[PDB]
Design a protein around this ligand. Structure first.
Ligand SMILES: C=C(/N=C/c1c(COP(=O)(O)O)cnc(C)c1O)C(=O)O
Ligand SMILES: C=C(/N=C/c1c(COP(=O)(O)O)cnc(C)c1O)C(=O)O
Ligand SMILES: [K+]
Ligand SMILES: [K+]
Lengths: 385, 386
């Protein structure tokens, strides 16, 4: 489970048995034709894969480019999170677990997990930072209808980091019954590999769809990056292909303000939630609070596979600010009639930063923005527009 | 054409006759134009997300001892079947040279679908919506605002869909040079019921190809909710006279005997509404009455004339379920399948309790998703008492 120097299993010893059991069960389903049959049927008819690769004619006109959007917003529940949640809750069911727990920030992982738990008939307890239960209220409502318990977490910065802290405490307290479902590619081995291997369907589809429109590989693929799962999923089949892969982190109020979530660009090597990776830390090794207008990007660490891709130059990383992402959310809504997630708006904002005239650019549209409507319409920057 | 037996026609102020003649001419032109269907079908595929899956609902199948399949129109862009029609009509509007779109909406799904198609095609868009529906369907008001549409709350009459359409039709008549009126359902003067039904019948054409892959035969039942009738017409039309039992489910509101429902086919009388001769809730002096439904998209006093004709000729069977039965089915699908359905669609799902389907293959049109309904449902007194 190492990506260069990053990754590993940096956990309390009591979890080692659970992780060994998960690693064995996962290696088992890796060759299990009936796991993949059932999983792939649900991806097709329940989640709605393959998702289209949409030529965004008006965006393309505005930038002078050929811009395609990989439409993960069209999945069931409205984000790429469902790819991973169905796969892991299916695994949990096959391992004989009876209960699921997870932490969630935008609420999309929580909704995806609650959906799979409902489908597979499992008890489901979702931890969510209290500030996130307010700016992402639509997803609290969906999780309640799906039968999940939602526990607001009032400690720390009351956002995703603190929700994951409490879900991990719950998992340790409940190891007999409970499977912990990470939403991103952060966590102790084998979780980064499991999540990335459920999300790489995105890149696999893209790789097949782009020669049908343009007859070669794209020039660029752009995806937003917090923990990194939607970006790992679309990048992984293109690593070392020569495509320019660009991961976009949350620059928040600005990378020099101290109010951002840009772990690769501004963090230091450290340990978070089981991985050795880049973490926003002070000079005494204390993890710092992140900030982003996007609840899904508001997390102080990043997946170890991305730390490794950055170090080896296989993927390039940069950031855009809260205001740039808000502008891109509004622009896509107005020009293409698609309301993007505020996470994915960071990737769309980056179109203004590359020299793309004449280029074929794929943007991973990781989810839809209905959860973000109240927050965007009330934001002071948008109110000053 | 225009007439489905004695139903339908063009019952409109004379000032609309010229626009309707130009519309029918333009439509007959595109119905043969490969360049139109190439652009349209490309958008249905990549923009809207078709074909939609036909999903085997294993837990619901186990509950009813049946094989229950859901046609997943909830998975379209914007979350309902309305986008099939909105993309096609705004594309036609563009081809006819119009620069502005107008419509009325109740659930707000047709409003959002029309607004997204207007945004895609660079047209001005003005949506009318009854004030009551702007409150119980607030999520869709917010979506339309981000899409760049103007949302006009309508404060007259019963402040729901019938009123909104009245105001959109007034706006159309005031703006006939620039503006294309987009109906959301199969109600209206000819050629609109045929246009709408012909954009929605992709639902049934897909279903007709998908169900042999899953069962090796036609289903025993196809069930869809009906107010205007567009999603039901879309899924039924390719199965007319096939021997499948087709069941349209109207809104029964508080009860077919309470006077508080929207069950036009079951309890209306012949009348004229919004251009069509069809079944309309009215008193015995010919005055249209206010409809009621817990579902904003079913809360309308008329029904499409093709449905009046299918009912009279027996080609489709019609019934109703109550508000409380629809709420129960809303909660049920959410808990059992992890799919939160529109409250409109929940009427069709609730009807699975009303027939004997043991050993039967049943397709239900899952016409939209229910995120717009969450706040209303969670605060409904009957859900609170549960
Ligand atoms: C952390 C969460 N969401 C993350 C997110 C992300 C960023 O997560 P990854 O860096 O793991 O893709 C991107 N797009 C959407 C629509 C998302 O919801 C959550 O739902 O708990
Ligand atoms: C009237 C509206 N909606 C109707 C509706 C209906 C009933 O309309 P038809 O009877 O035209 O399918 C069914 N399902 C969904 C998701 C709907 O939104 C509207 O959005 O304006
Ligand atoms: K981060
Ligand atoms: K009706």
């Amino acid at each position: 489970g190492n990506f260069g120097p990053y990754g590993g299993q940096n956990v309390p010893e009591i979890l080692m048995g659970a992780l060994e059991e998960l690693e064995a069960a996962y290696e088992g389903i890796m060759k299990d034709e009936s796991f993949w049959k059932e999983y792939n049927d649900l991806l097709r008819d329940y989640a709605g894969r393959p998702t289209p690769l949409y030529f965004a004619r008006r965006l393309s006109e505005k930038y002078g480019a050929r811009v395609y959007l990989k439409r993960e917003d069209l999945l069931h529940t409205g984000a790429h999170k469902i790819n991973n949640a169905i796969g892991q809750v299916l695994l949990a069911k096959l391992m004989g677990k009876t209960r699921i727990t997870a932490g969630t920030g935008a609420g999309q992982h929580g909704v995806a997990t609650a959906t799979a738990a409902a489908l597979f008939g499992m008890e489901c307890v979702i931890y969510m930072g209290e500030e996130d239960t307010i700016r992402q209220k639509l997803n609290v409502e969906r999780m309640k209808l799906l039968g999940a318990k939602v526990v607001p977490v009032k400690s720390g910065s009351r956002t995703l980091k603190d929700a994951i802290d409490e879900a991990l405490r719950d998992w340790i307290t409940n190891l007999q019954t409970t499977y912990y479902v990470p939403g991103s590619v952060v966590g102790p081995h084998p979780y980064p590999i499991i999540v990335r291997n459920f999300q790489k369907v995105i890149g696999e589809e893209t790789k097949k769809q782009i020669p049908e429109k343009e007859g070669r590989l794209p020039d660029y693929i752009v995806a937003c990056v917090s923990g990194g799962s939607n970006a790992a999923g679309i990048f992984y089949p293109f690593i070392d292909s020569g495509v320019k892969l660009i991961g976009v982190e949350a620059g928040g109020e600005g990378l020099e303000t101290g109010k951002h979530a840009a772990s690769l660009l501004k963090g230091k090597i450290g340990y978070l939630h089981g991985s050795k990776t880049f973490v926003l830390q002070d000079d005494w090794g204390q993890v710092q609070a992140s900030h982003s207008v996007s609840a899904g990007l508001d997390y102080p660490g990043v997946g170890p596979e991305h730390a490794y891709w950055r170090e080896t130059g296989k993927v390039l990383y940069d950031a855009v600010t809260d205001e740039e992402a808000l502008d891109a959310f509004i622009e896509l809504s107005r020009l293409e009639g698609i309301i993007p997630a505020l996470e994915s708006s960071h990737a769309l904002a980056y179109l203004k930063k590359i020299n793309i005239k004449g280029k074929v650019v794929v943007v991973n549209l990781s989810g839809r923005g209905d959860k973000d409507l109240e927050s965007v319409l009330n934001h002071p920057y948008v109110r000053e527009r």
